[PDB]
Amino acid sequence: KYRVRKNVLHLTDTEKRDFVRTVLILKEKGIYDRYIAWHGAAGKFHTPPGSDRNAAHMSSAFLPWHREYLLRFERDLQSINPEVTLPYWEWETDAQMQDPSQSQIWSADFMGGNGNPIKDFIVDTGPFAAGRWTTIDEQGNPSGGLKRNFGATKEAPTLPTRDDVLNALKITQYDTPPWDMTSQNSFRNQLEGFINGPQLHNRVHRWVGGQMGVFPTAPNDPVFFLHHANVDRIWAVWQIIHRNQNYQPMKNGPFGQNFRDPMYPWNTTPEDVMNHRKLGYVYDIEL
Ligand SMILES: [Cu+2]
Ligand SMILES: [Cu+2]
Numbered sequence: 001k002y003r004v005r006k007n008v009l010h011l012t013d014t015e016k017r018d019f020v021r022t023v024l025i026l027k028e029k030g031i032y033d034r035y036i037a038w039h040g041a042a043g044k045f046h047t048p049p050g051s052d053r054n055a056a057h058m059s060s061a062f063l064p065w066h067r068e069y070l071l072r073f074e075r076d077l078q079s080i081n082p083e084v085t086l087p088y089w090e091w092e093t094d095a096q097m098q099d100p101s102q103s104q105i106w107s108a109d110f111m112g113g114n115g116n117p118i119k120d121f122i123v124d125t126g127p128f129a130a131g132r133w134t135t136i137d138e139q140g141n142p143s144g145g146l147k148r149n150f151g152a153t154k155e156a157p158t159l160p161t162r163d164d165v166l167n168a169l170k171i172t173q174y175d176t177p178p179w180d181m182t183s184q185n186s187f188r189n190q191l192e193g194f195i196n197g198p199q200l201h202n203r204v205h206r207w208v209g210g211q212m213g214v215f216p217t218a219p220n221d222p223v224f225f226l227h228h229a230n231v232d233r234i235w236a237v238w239q240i241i242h243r244n245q246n247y248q249p250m251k252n253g254p255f256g257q258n259f260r261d262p263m264y265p266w267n268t269t270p271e272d273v274m275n276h277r278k279l280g281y282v283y284d285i286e287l
Contacts, residue, residue, distance in 0.1 A: 003074070003281035005229055008087045008105050010284070016110050019087065020127050022080045023222055027133070031076055036136055038069065038265055040216040045264045047256040053180055055264040057215065060175045060249060060257045062192050063235045064270035066228050068263060071279050073225060085281065088229035091204055095159035101150045111223050115148040115210060123148050123210070128222055135211065135220040146221055147210030156198055156206030164200055169238055175248045179257055187238055191231065201231050233283045236276050240286075247274060 011019070026032045042056035042065065053059035056066065074086045094100040106113045112126015122130045123146045130145035137143040151157050171187040183189040193202030204227055205212050211220040218224050247270050250259045260269050273279060 001277055001280075001282050003078075003085045004284055004287065005085050005233070005281055006087050006284050008089050008110075008226060009093075011087055013109070015087075018081060018084055019077075020110065022077050022084045024127065025080050026076060033136070035069070035073055036217070036219045037140065039219050040138060041265050042263075043216055045256070047254040051180075051254070053254060053257065055256050058181050058192070058194075060179045060188055060247070060253060061261075061263055061270060062188055063231075064247070064268075064273050065263050067232050067235070067273045067276065067279075068266065068268045070225065070228055070232055071273065071281075074281070086229045087226055088233055088283065089223065089226035090230055091159045091227065092162045092165050095161050100159055105223075105226070111226075112146075113148075114150045117149075121147045121149045121210060136217070138214075138216045143217070143220070148212065148221070149209035151207055152209050153206050153213075156203045158203075159207050160193075160200045160203050165234060168200060169234070169241060172242065172245065173248065174242075174245055177249070179249055179253045191234060191238075201227075232276070233285070236283060237285075239274075239276075247271075 006015075023032070039056065043054050045055040047053045047055060047059065055061060056069075070086060077084045077086065089105055094103040094105070097103065101114055105111050108125050110126065112123050112128050114123075115121030116124050119130075124130055127133070128146050133146055135143045135146055168187065168190040171185060171190055173185055173187065175188040176183045176186045181189070181194045189195060191200055193200035197203075198206050205215070205218060208221070208223065211217045212224065247259050249257060252258070255261055256264055259271050262269060276282070
């Protein structure tokens, strides 16, 4: 309950500065790199081998995997500056703006802005601009710059709306067999955004573009973590509203997807992270 994860649009200027500084330190110490790599690894871990499902996406473990990923990230932040917690990007309200790219999240003192079409959509403003911030490709080799291209695709010209979020919150089952991209009446799948896709979490990736657009190499962009903090909150809100439901599958899903299975690359189980308050943190909205 102690750590409070705040909306980005509410943070003081000094708070935004301290978050950025701490991420920059993490990167400099080489700690940031481990999080980009953990993510690419998990996506190449299919469950079972040959299938679409992987340790971190396109199945039941999606939500607990990323909650565990963010928890560890935030712990590392905390090591550097005990007063720093993970904010969340409330994309569904930015969606309501005339030009969501005008959002305060994209200012030069925070995330930086959109990509420069003259330079192949290389980002050149903000603390993460090419030259200030090195990036890595899928193979682990330098790629030479953060890229972004807001709303450029025909699939995802807009962020998801407050209605999309409310509607996913109405779903009664946490997931359904066969626990994959085709799962119907499934909260995990709806939030993941496959149903008439891309929606919700997937749609946000496509909207940002650049490294965010490609699931390996999505965490090269600090914004990845604000997006996933917002996804963690929506999940947290759902758990509150449907206190009677629990994670599924409890058993008989593919190994790595069940309630008491280790989530590659770690030993942590979905059970280990089910109660977000027992992990030491809460979202401002609860309070
Ligand atoms: Cu991911
Ligand atoms: Cu994601």
